[PDB]
């Protein structure tokens, strides 16, 4: 039942030292990051997860720079940050899955090159 402020796609060029893929939930209502879980899929496979209960993040080897700002989760921001290299090497559709206790939701954003 988590609602998102949907974004169809985001463009980036080589001048982006840091590439951000937006993910924003509008009905977030947790007061502690322990009850939040975040998962970012790319072409099906998970390329970034955040267990708020364990307070740990996981990334595959080809996505070594993927990270989200945990300070912004309670306010609904689960945007995925990475570097230009991980960006040029991973162009396509990303999925943002956010869990808050029993509630959950997903949104799709395409990463394109200009």
């Amino acid at each position, epitope marked *: 039942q988590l609602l998102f402020n949907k974004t169809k796609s985001v463009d980036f060029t080589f001048g982006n030292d840091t590439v951000v893929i937006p993910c924003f939930v509008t009905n977030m209502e947790a007061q502690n990051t322990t009850e939040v879980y975040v998962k970012w899929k790319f072409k099906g496979r998970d390329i970034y997860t955040f267990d708020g209960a364990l307070n740990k993040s996981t990334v595959p080897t080809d996505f070594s720079s993927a990270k989200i700002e945990v300070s912004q989760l309670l306010k609904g921001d689960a945007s995925l940050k990475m570097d230009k290299s991980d960006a040029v090497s991973h162009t396509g559709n990303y999925t943002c*899955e956010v*869990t808050e*206790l029993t509630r959950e939701g997903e949104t799709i954003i395409e990463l394109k090159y200009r």
Partner: antibody
Amino acid sequence: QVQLVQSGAEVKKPGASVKVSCKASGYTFTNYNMHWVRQAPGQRLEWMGTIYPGNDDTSYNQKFKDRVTITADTSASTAYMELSSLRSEDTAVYYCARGGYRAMDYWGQGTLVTVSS
Amino acid sequence: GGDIVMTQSPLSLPVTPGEPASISCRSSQSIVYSNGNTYLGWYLQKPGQSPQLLIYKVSNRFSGVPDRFSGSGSGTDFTLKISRVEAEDVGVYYCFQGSHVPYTFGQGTKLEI
């Protein structure tokens, strides 16, 4: 203080219809699903269906196809479950439960529905 | 549209306070949804009360539940574990799956002293 309040118990003759209400309070009604679970006396819990009051998107158990309608009033923070063509196997306690898409957390006190003769 | 057979053993579990307890729940098919999550929940129905949520997503404790209850498992095998049984834990326990419609519960385990 999340609290789900349902209508009073009901007794109906076989073939009639019941409509059980479920008043929600203590949370935002439009950012939570509402589920409806029944339990025949001395049996297991049975999931009947769910609804998302944001766009009245329902998902139903096909066992109750064309018999159950789960509606919602967002301005009243209330959900409803209407079961028609009642038979004897429908005598059960009918619970509403808040929760997400695929799990329930807080339940109502249940509504007893007795199908007589 | 087919029920996923949720089977719980034992059906009855007597135990003295402080002694640990363990309930197993097996499903006919995999509770792994298409997104990789497993939507297996655990519900306690204390006698004379409505059901209440204990564990969601196999292992995640709910808000007010004590640290005694522990959920675990994967695939089709799931286990609920109580480290120290208290006098307020008496009731009927239901495992539940929310991956495949229709959502199906277990048979029920009656906990008692």
